[PDB]
């Protein structure tokens, strides 16, 4: 109508695709919603920067498990939840985990279902109105700056059913799927890494039935919470497999033998008329592969390796090379680490655990967004719980520095139990989760100390409530005991004072941090005394 | 880093020449009374107080082989070159981990003053000094990558840790500066940068006091 | 007092020997803290690896009570503990079964993937009193398609486990505890006494393995002569409604009696509600912030409860990493039990425990914890275990501690303790010192502002310029008027102030 | 959950019953008929009602154990006294079943 072409031109998405759905300037309105979903800038730092941003803003959980009500915001770039009630901080993740099922499921298929509340075990045990709700409220440029959803359940035999309202989610993902359809576009990643990932890796890789090349695998199983390492493995050497081989080689080798049978079909040999047939339909069927996969605007394996090698390597300090040998008549995927070649199942549990997972999400991204120069700046969400996981404080220094390094445009919710990680992030991340006795809490808060760029030890204190020295170590207190004695003393070196120094210097020695803490106290104190005796 | 005062060429150092004579025959015993003298215990190049250490060639004995049994070149530094354990600052590291310098390029502790070229911050880094160009602030920067004196974390918390110290000990000083008269008030600082002739990393601690 | 040579006259005769090797084995004493001490210790003193995984040569000396190995990422910390535990399981083996074979190293894994000589070797050197003061062992591989085997030495190992095997079948002696707790730990008939020696080297410490033992021994033990027992079933079969439930309970305490007579010395064990009362003494002492453990039935599930910080709650109540701690202690509660029936205190039995990542999903409070009572609950374990935490290391005397050099190019001889001691130490010092990490984050720019600051007021002969200005006020903005930088940056005013003023009255 | 009364509708029409579903809810209802104590306090008191009458007959053999039940009664009747219809709900349906099925006593 008049009004939704008023609001289109205003830059509405919606409208603009609504216009284009009913007319099917059919052209134009297709033209604008694809220009919406695509259009995007290089900034100052040479990163692609999408005009228009995706990412989840709010969550509100209403007797939702322990919850009665809990509302989060979220940030654009970085949320990380910190606390000890670990089996609340996973909650909330589970949460959106479920509400992001419902865009993947539309992505996919028409009228695709996410994921639904459980009846027995999402419903708090004391919710007086004996339902559930997850309320998400998500953002896509200033065209589309609220997409609410919805997840509901009620227990049995209530009076009124509490139904889901998915409909704003499934109309989002309908254009991405409509438009990519008509001509390929870029798409949102989404993603959970629970702390299954951690697992074994099984050695023997399965033979590709060719599920793997396929564009939309990259949402397969991507909110299990494991990745699946397993089908990197496959793709990385199918990729190797197709760089190795010529493109059309088949083809050109199809096309001669159907010359040869035509030939030979010619020169009066019937009986092999339905073997030409055969392979005029394999012929046909490749060239469609081929065209598809023409059609399909994909990168060329040849980048699309080059790719995910330099992602894995710039991400996992110990790996400086990753390549795909081919001995023994099978292939294995091989790395250099610390400067020596292994196997992957030769690598240490931490770094196969976090390989796995930034190989994981660089696949995908590389196969959801083949029209970008660099793929891994594509837009989507990505969920990562105990963010620490087998790490070593070195590697905990670096590790969000350089996710977010590797992946700019991703929205990253994550928990953590190390200081060492919140020293790399700003106070306004951070949200804190300190439940009551009931598990209940209304709002996250912000701590009130700025962690980035602070020493660990105040973020102990400051934030995690844990002191700088082992409280139930006796040692840990004589400094204290020591400073004490002096100032009761009127700051001279007593009989008792001495034998703790004497302790002091014995157990943590000479040029211990703890002595040397000493004899400024010490020198200090004369110091002052002298002046004290100067004013009398 | 220190200004030293070397004096006395040690008696078995005419005993053996460079050329005939191979370095592992000396007893290194009979060297180190004489350096301890000059050093006072102390590593030349960080300040460490020496447990692990080592006498040092300052030009190498692979490149320059005329200059192996002479006093000039004779230093204490820190850490083994034997055991079976990484060491990363001062002699071992100007040998295996700095690779490629040239000898003209750092400061000989003997020869010069340190204090000219370089600086100690509070912080704990220690820097060029304010106000250099050229050649001397080419033997700072050089000085400070080749010792490794800021890449090495143990020495870097180490010195940093000494500092922070006693900056209540220095503020406490400097507010006293007002009520006492000047005589007084200079043989308080007098005692104080006396008795850091006896502590760890003593050249950061004299600039946090001077 | 020579063991084999005592066990080896005992084995071709008779019983002065017997008697010998039995008090080797079983004598002890109890020291002034209370404590049950063997005379004759069995710990790992020693391991050797040459070419094994990254290591071309590697040698390591243990300490009898708690050895911590610390590294980086890739060091090698999992590698040793493997190595250790593929050398116990012969022990293992040969203690259930004579002849029985324990693990080996694998040829397409274990041998170093550039060793010119194309095996590995593991060897292990333990220790078993004055008696026998060594007892080498030595694990081996070729690689695929070498032309020469080169063969395991487990003889030594085979003649020891003997030994504890045929004096426990003539008469019940306590046995050595082997257990491995790895990473995997975290993932989600009748018992009898060598059920304690099933799956200890791998597949130990699992929390839903705990809770169903732990519900069962509580039944069982819901609610004493065979004859007098059996003439109390005759007398209530007898009477017999109201009493039937007292009749199944005195025949099940009655079949339950007739077994015990019946089993074996070798099997011989304590009571279920003993071992229940140990194992729960166990949890309570060893794990952070549990007071008690308790099965409830009242609600109509059977539902294992703790007093956590004071408050009653549920097991799944629990964060992850009070779960798996509480897992790991009580499986080894239990075998420890099941092992050493005749001593008072059955945890202070001898044996060799491996422990993989202990703060594996531990909050930073409860690292602070989780050392200090371990060996006061299991005081003659050898505890060898890995971690990267400076609060663990904290709780820890350096002595026991094993560290890897940052730089460590694999060819390495020995490991060796830290220069500083940690115990009671400073997180920020154990950081710097002993794990080689700075205490500010250096990729990020606003850990070397005060240092820019600093120097930016000494070139300017300390007073407050127009960028000094810029950068403190950037400084307070960023960590506030509270922050321990800026107080850092006002000290520096004030200092340079001073010293400045100092210069010009010269 | 078994206990919860709109279980009384699951898999109703599939055909089998649900027989894994009785077992379940007849040991819940079984455990909350022990654990309430005024039950287990009647039942405690039956049983050392018999086992007196039985001491009382002339077998002096049992005494050790009444004098044992008579302290597991003070005991209980010492700790905080408060009709279950769970018990209830258990004798209906013990009844039902043996009424019913004519090997079942
Ligand atoms: N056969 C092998 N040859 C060489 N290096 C190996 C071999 N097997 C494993 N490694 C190396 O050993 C390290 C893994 O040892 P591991 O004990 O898991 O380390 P961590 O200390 O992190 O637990 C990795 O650096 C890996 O490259
Ligand atoms: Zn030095």
Request: glycine share 6%.
């Given at each position: 109508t008049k009004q939704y072409e008023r609001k289109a031109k205003g830059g509405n998405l919606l409208s603009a695709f609504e216009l284009y759905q009913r007319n099917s300037l059919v052209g134009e309105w297709f033209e604008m919603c694809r220009d919406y979903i695509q259009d995007g800038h290089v900034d100052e730092s040479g990163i692609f920067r999408p005009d228009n941003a995706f990412y989840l803003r709010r969550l509100t959980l209403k007797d939702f498990r322990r919850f009665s009500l809990l509302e989060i915001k979220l940030e654009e770039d970085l949320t990380v939840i910190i606390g000890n009630n670990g089996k609340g901080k996973t909650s909330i993740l589970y949460a959106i985990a479920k509400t992001l099922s419902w865009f993947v499921a539309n992505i996919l298929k028409e009228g695709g279902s996410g994921q639904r509340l459980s009846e027995m075990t999402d419903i708090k045990n004391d919710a007086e109105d004996r339902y559930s709700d997850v309320s998400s409220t998500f953002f896509f440029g200033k065209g589309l700056k609220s997409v609410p959803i919805r997840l509901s359940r009620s227990a049995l035999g209530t009076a009124e059913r509490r139904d889901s309202e998915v409909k704003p989610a499934k109309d989002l993902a309908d254009i991405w799927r409509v438009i990519n359809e008509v001509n390929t576009i870029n798409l949102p990643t989404f993603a959970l890494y629970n702390v299954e990932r951690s697992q074994p890796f099984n050695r023997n890789i399965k033979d590709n039935?060719?599920?793997?090349?396929?564009?939309?695998?990259?949402?397969?199983?991507?909110?299990?919470?494991?990745?699946?390492?397993?089908?990197?493995?496959?793709?990385?050497?199918?990729?190797?497999?197709?760089?190795?081989?010529?493109?059309?080689?088949?083809?050109?080798?199809?096309?001669?033998?159907?010359?040869?049978?035509?030939?030979?079909?010619?020169?009066?040999?019937?009986?092999?008329?339905?073997?030409?047939?055969?392979?005029?339909?394999?012929?046909?069927?490749?060239?469609?592969?081929?065209?598809?996969?023409?059609?399909?605007?994909?990168?060329?394996?040849?980048?699309?390796?080059?790719?995910?090698?330099?992602?894995?390597?710039?991400?996992?300090?110990?790996?400086?090379?990753?390549?795909?040998?081919?001995?023994?008549?099978?292939?294995?995927?091989?790395?250099?680490?610390?400067?020596?070649?292994?196997?992957?199942?030769?690598?240490?549990?931490?770094?196969?655990?976090?390989?796995?997972?930034?190989?994981?999400?660089?696949?995908?991204?590389?196969?959801?967004?083949?029209?970008?120069?660099?793929?891994?700046?594509?837009?989507?969400?990505?969920?990562?719980?105990?963010?620490?996981?087998?790490?070593?404080?070195?590697?905990?220094?670096?590790?969000?520095?350089?996710?977010?390094?590797?992946?700019?445009?991703?929205?990253?919710?994550?928990?953590?139990?190390?200081?060492?990680?919140?020293?790399?992030?700003?106070?306004?991340?951070?949200?804190?989760?300190?439940?009551?006795?009931?598990?209940?809490?209304?709002?996250?808060?912000?701590?009130?100390?700025?962690?980035?760029?602070?020493?660990?030890?105040?973020?102990?204190?400051?934030?995690?409530?844990?002191?700088?020295?082992?409280?139930?170590?006796?040692?840990?207190?004589?400094?204290?005991?020591?400073?004490?004695?002096?100032?009761?003393?009127?700051?001279?070196?007593?009989?008792?004072?001495?034998?703790?120094?004497?302790?002091?210097?014995?157990?943590?020695?000479?040029?211990?941090?703890?002595?040397?803490?000493?004899?400024?106290?010490?020198?200090?104190?004369?110091?002052?005394?002298?002046?004290?005796?100067?004013?009398? | 880093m220190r200004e030293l005062a070397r004096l006395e060429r040690p008696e078995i150092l005419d005993q053996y020449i460079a050329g005939q004579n191979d370095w592992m025959e000396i007893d290194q015993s009979a060297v180190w009374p004489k350096l301890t003298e000059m050093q006072g215990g102390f590593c030349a190049y960080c300040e460490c107080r020496l447990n692990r250490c080592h006498i040092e060639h300052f030009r190498p004995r692979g490149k320059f082989p005329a200059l192996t049994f002479i006093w000039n070149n004779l230093f204490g530094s820190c850490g083994d070159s034997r055991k079976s354990g990484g060491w990363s600052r001062c002699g071992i590291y100007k040998d295996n981990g700095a690779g490629a310098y040239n000898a003209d390029d750092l400061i000989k502790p003997d020869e010069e003053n340190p204090d000219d070229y370089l600086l100690f911050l509070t912080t704990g880094e220690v820097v060029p000094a304010i106000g250099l160009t050229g050649r001397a602030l080419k033997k700072a920067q050089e000085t400070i990558r080749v010792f490794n004196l800021n890449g090495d974390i143990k020495l870097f918390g180490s010195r940093r840790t000494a500092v922070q110290a006693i900056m209540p000990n220095v503020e406490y000083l400097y507010t006293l500066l007002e009520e006492f008269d000047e005589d007084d008030w200079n043989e308080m600082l007098r005692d104080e940068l006396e008795k850091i002739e006896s502590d760890e990393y003593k050249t950061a601690l004299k600039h946090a006091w001077t």
């Open positions: 039935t060719g599920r793997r090349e396929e564009r939309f695998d990259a949402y397969s199983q991507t909110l299990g919470g494991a990745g699946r390492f397993d089908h990197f493995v496959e793709w990385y050497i199918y990729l190797h497999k197709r760089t190795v081989s010529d493109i059309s080689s088949s083809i050109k080798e199809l096309e001669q033998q159907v010359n040869d049978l035509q030939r030979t079909v010619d020169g009066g040999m019937v009986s092999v008329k339905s073997l030409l047939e055969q392979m005029k339909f394999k012929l046909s069927e490749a060239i469609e592969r081929n065209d598809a996969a023409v059609s399909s605007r994909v990168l060329t394996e040849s980048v699309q390796k080059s790719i995910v090698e330099k992602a894995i390597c710039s991400v996992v300090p110990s790996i400086s090379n990753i390549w795909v040998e081919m001995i023994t008549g099978s292939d294995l995927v091989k790395v250099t680490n610390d400067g020596h070649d292994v196997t992957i199942d030769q690598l240490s549990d931490g770094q196969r655990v976090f390989l796995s997972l930034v190989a994981d999400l660089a696949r995908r991204m590389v196969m959801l967004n083949p029209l970008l120069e660099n793929p891994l700046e594509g837009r989507g969400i990505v969920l990562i719980d105990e963010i620490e996981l087998h790490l070593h404080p070195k590697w905990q220094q670096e590790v969000i520095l350089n996710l977010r390094s590797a992946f700019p445009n991703i929205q990253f919710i994550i928990t953590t139990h190390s200081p060492i990680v919140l020293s790399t992030i700003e106070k306004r991340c951070i949200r804190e989760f300190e439940p009551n006795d009931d598990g209940d809490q209304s709002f996250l808060d912000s701590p009130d100390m700025q962690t980035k760029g602070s020493e660990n030890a105040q973020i102990l204190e400051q934030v995690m409530n844990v002191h700088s020295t082992p409280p139930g170590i006796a040692e840990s207190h004589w400094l204290g005991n020591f400073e004490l004695l002096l100032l009761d003393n009127s700051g001279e070196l007593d009989n008792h004072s001495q034998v703790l120094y004497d302790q002091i210097k014995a157990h943590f020695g000479i040029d211990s941090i703890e002595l040397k803490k000493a004899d400024s106290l010490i020198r200090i104190n004369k110091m002052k005394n002298k002046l004290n005796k100067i004013r009398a | -």
